Amino acid sequence: HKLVPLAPADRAPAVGQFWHVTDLHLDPTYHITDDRTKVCASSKGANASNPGPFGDVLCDSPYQLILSAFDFIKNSGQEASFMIWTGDSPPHVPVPELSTGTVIKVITNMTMTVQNLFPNLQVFPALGNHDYWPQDQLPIVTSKVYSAVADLWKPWLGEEAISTLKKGGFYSQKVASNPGLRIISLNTNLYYGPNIMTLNKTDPANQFEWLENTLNSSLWNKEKVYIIAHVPVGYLPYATDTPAIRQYYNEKLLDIFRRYSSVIAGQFYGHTHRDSLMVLSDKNGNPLNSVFVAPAVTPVKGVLQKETNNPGVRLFQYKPGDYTLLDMVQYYLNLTEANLKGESNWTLEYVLTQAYSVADLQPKSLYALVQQFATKDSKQFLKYYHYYFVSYDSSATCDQHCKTLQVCAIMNLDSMSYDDCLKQHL
Numbered sequence: 525h526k527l528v529p530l531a532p533a534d535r536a537p538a539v540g541q542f543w544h545v546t547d548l549h550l551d552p553t554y555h556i557t558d559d560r561t562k563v564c565a566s567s568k569g570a571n572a573s574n575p576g577p578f579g580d581v582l583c584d585s586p587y588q589l590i591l592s593a594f595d596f597i598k599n600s601g602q603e604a605s606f607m608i609w610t611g612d613s614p615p616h617v618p619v620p621e622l623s624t625g626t627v628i629k630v631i632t633n634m635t636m637t638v639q640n641l642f643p644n645l646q647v648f649p650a651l652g653n654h655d656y657w658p659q660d661q662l663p664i665v666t667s668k669v670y671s672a673v674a675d676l677w678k679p680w681l682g683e684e685a686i687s688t689l690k691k692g693g694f695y696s697q698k699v700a701s702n703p704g705l706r707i708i709s710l711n712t713n714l715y716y717g718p719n720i721m722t723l724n725k726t727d728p729a730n731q732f733e734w735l736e737n738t739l740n741s742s743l744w745n746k747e748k749v750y751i752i753a754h755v756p757v758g759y760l761p762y763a764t765d766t767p768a769i770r771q772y773y774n775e776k777l778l779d780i781f782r783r784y785s786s787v788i789a790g791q792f793y794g795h796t797h798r799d800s801l802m803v804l805s806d807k808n809g810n811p812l813n814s815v816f817v818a819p820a821v822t823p824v825k826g827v828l829q830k831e832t833n834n835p836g837v838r839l840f841q842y843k844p845g846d847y848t849l850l851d852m853v854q855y856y857l858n859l860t861e862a863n864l865k866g867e868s869n870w871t872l873e874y875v876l877t878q879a880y881s882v883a884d885l886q887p888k889s890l891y892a893l894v895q896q897f898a899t900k901d902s903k904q905f906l907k908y909y910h911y912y913f914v915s916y917d918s919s920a921t922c923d924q925h926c927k928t929l930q931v932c933a934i935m936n937l938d939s940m941s942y943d944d945c946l947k948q949h950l
């Protein structure tokens with residue numbers, strides 16, 4: 525007779541879960557026609573290679589492909605308390621074939637698709653570099669796109685998040701279903717090389733100052749943070765000595781993340797359209813923070829490229845009330861198979877702990893895995909390289925130079941450590 529909260533049984537709490545989707549790249553022009561140069565504007569006049577209802581490797585996503593991905597999530601039987609959605613909704617077409625209004629229409633379509641299918645799910649979006657017109661020119665002051673997405677994302681975001689989004693394309697937001705957890709959604713397109721609007725700016729849109737203040741507040745309020753953004757930190761794994769964002773910004777952002785590694789329980793990016801790991805470490809090689817780059821829904825590639833990805837979506841598992849990452853489940857669509865029979869079969873690609881025999885996703889666990897990758901003829905690395913393209917090509921091989929670039933990028937996010945790795949291993 526005393527109104528005490530009812531104690532849960534002595535069972536183990538279920539893990540928490542969230543989805544990560546990215547790089548949808550809807551092409552509304554997609555249609556099958558005999559002249560394969562007219563299947564999709566995103567192929568820019570190339571003949572689509574072998575187009576079907578779920579897309580083509582030379583095209584961005586048909587609406588049916590995106591719908592199949594979200595329908596899979598909806599019908600998966602997995603519980604999830606939120607979703608993160610890291611940008612890039614319009615297709616790869618020349619700048620004159622788009623407009624601000626068209627970009628907003630595509631982002632609206634994707635947002636409303638998600639809201640329609642998941643009415644009870646809090647979603648945390650980030651802007652991508654194609655989420656603006658012209659592409660990549662994301663500004664340092666308010667804009668029609670920033671205002672539009674603040675309006676579109678109001679169902680998921682509080683007043684303060686809406687205000688920062690409208691001004692600079694970034695926000696932080698407490699996760700309603702997960703007390704103690706905050707999402708920081710950065711606009712890393714401000715740091716992306718093609719952005720003329722931020723040339724020579726030390727702190728475009730004051731995002732670094734804002735990020736430092738936000739992380740310091742989380743530190744003192746005993747929160748944990750998941751960082752989400754479109755373009756990742758670190759180095760491109762397929763090129764030599766090329767930071768994904770401008771070096772000055774990569775160095776500066778990584779310094780903030782090292783300083784706040786104790787608060788940051790995960791970092792989640794897109795843009796690359798590949799499945800990559802990174803481990804942020806200190807200058808002496810001690811692991812600090814795990815970084816997860818998710819592959820795209822779109823399977824697009826250019827004609828010059830040999831490989832591409834299969835469509836992917838992924839799920840993370842975390843410790844409730846603590847937010848340590850426990851696992852990652854990557855799902856995919858075998859696009860060739862789905863197009864041949866005309867039916868999608870979104871399916872499990874791998875569970876990270878099972879694929880790699882690691883205990884969890886903590887920095888020390890993943891650092892040890894990457895040390896295994898570095899061993900000669902590592903079977904773990906062979907598996908990783910197959911998963912990098914979401915199992916698009918089981919015969920893809922990574923020669924010595926290719927492997928050095930991959931492992932160096934996985935392990936070394938800043939210039940000094942990356943270049944030292946090249947020195948040792950080229």
Ligand SMILES: *[C@@H]1O[C@H](CO)[C@@H](O[C@@H]2O[C@H](CO)[C@@H](O[C@@H]3O[C@H](CO[C@H]4O[C@H](CO)[C@@H](O)[C@H](O)[C@@H]4O)[C@@H](O)[C@H](O[C@H]4O[C@H](CO)[C@@H](O)[C@H](O)[C@@H]4O)[C@@H]3O)[C@H](O)[C@H]2NC(C)=O)[C@H](O)[C@H]1NC(C)=O
Nearest residue numbers: 834856857858859860861862864873914915916917918919
């Ligand atoms: C996603 O779904 C696709 C579609 O099903 C799968 O791709 C098929 O994979 C099968 C099995 O690997 C392929 O069949 C094999 O092809 C080998 C030849 O490789 C390439 O060369 C031909 C040109 O001659 C290409 O046209 C072809 O598409 C391949 O890209 C052959 O060596 C195999 O022959 C032998 O295989 C076994 C013995 O191992 C026996 O059963 C056979 O009798 C024969 O002895 C075999 O034919 C098939 O070609 C692929 N199709 C396409 C369209 O690519 C993917 O594997 C799947 N992805 C995942 C991750 O599962």
Ligand SMILES: *[C@@H]1O[C@H](CO[C@@H]2O[C@@H](C)[C@@H](O)[C@@H](O)[C@@H]2O)[C@@H](O[C@@H]2O[C@H](CO)[C@@H](O)[C@H](O)[C@H]2NC(C)=O)[C@H](O)[C@H]1NC(C)=O
Nearest residue numbers: 558559560561562563567568569570571572573574582827
């Ligand atoms: C796009 O493809 C068309 C068609 O290519 C032909 O059909 C395919 C199914 C395949 O079998 C190809 O090897 C064929 O060539 C191209 O148009 C044809 O191009 C060839 C060579 O220039 C020519 O002999 C034909 O007369 C052309 N027209 C047709 C109707 O066949 C076209 O060049 C391709 N465009 C691009 C940008 O690649």
Ligand SMILES: *[C@@H]1O[C@H](CO[C@@H]2O[C@@H](C)[C@@H](O)[C@@H](O)[C@@H]2O)[C@@H](O[C@@H]2O[C@H](CO)[C@@H](O)[C@H](O)[C@H]2NC(C)=O)[C@H](O)[C@H]1NC(C)=O
Nearest residue numbers: 733734735736737738739740741742743744745746783784
């Ligand atoms: C990071 O924050 C600490 C703590 O400041 C507090 O943070 C919140 C809880 C909020 O309630 C603020 O009003 C608090 O002040 C900052 O520490 C302060 O530093 C000044 C020196 O400049 C010192 O005089 C105060 O006593 C400190 N406060 C406490 C509680 O120790 C710190 O400056 C912030 N760091 C950065 C880089 O911004």
Ligand SMILES: *[C@@H]1O[C@H](CO)[C@@H](O[C@@H]2O[C@H](CO)[C@@H](O)[C@H](O)[C@H]2NC(C)=O)[C@H](O)[C@H]1NC(C)=O
Nearest residue numbers: 551552553586587588632633634635636637640
């Ligand atoms: C998002 O866009 C797709 C098309 O690009 C829409 O689906 C099409 O809707 C029109 C009517 O508006 C139909 O004529 C098409 O046949 C539909 N299907 C396809 C595959 O094109 C979809 O309605 C839009 N969704 C939202 C929420 O706006």
Ligand SMILES: *[C@@H]1O[C@H](CO)[C@@H](O)[C@H](O)[C@H]1NC(C)=O
Nearest residue numbers: 858861868869870871872873
């Ligand atoms: C769907 O994909 C996977 C293959 O990895 C498998 O679980 C299932 O059997 C596939 N579909 C059918 C019809 O078998």
Ligand SMILES: [Zn+2]
Nearest residue numbers: 547549612795
């Ligand atoms: Zn993209």
Ligand SMILES: [Zn+2]
Nearest residue numbers: 612652653795
């Ligand atoms: Zn991008």
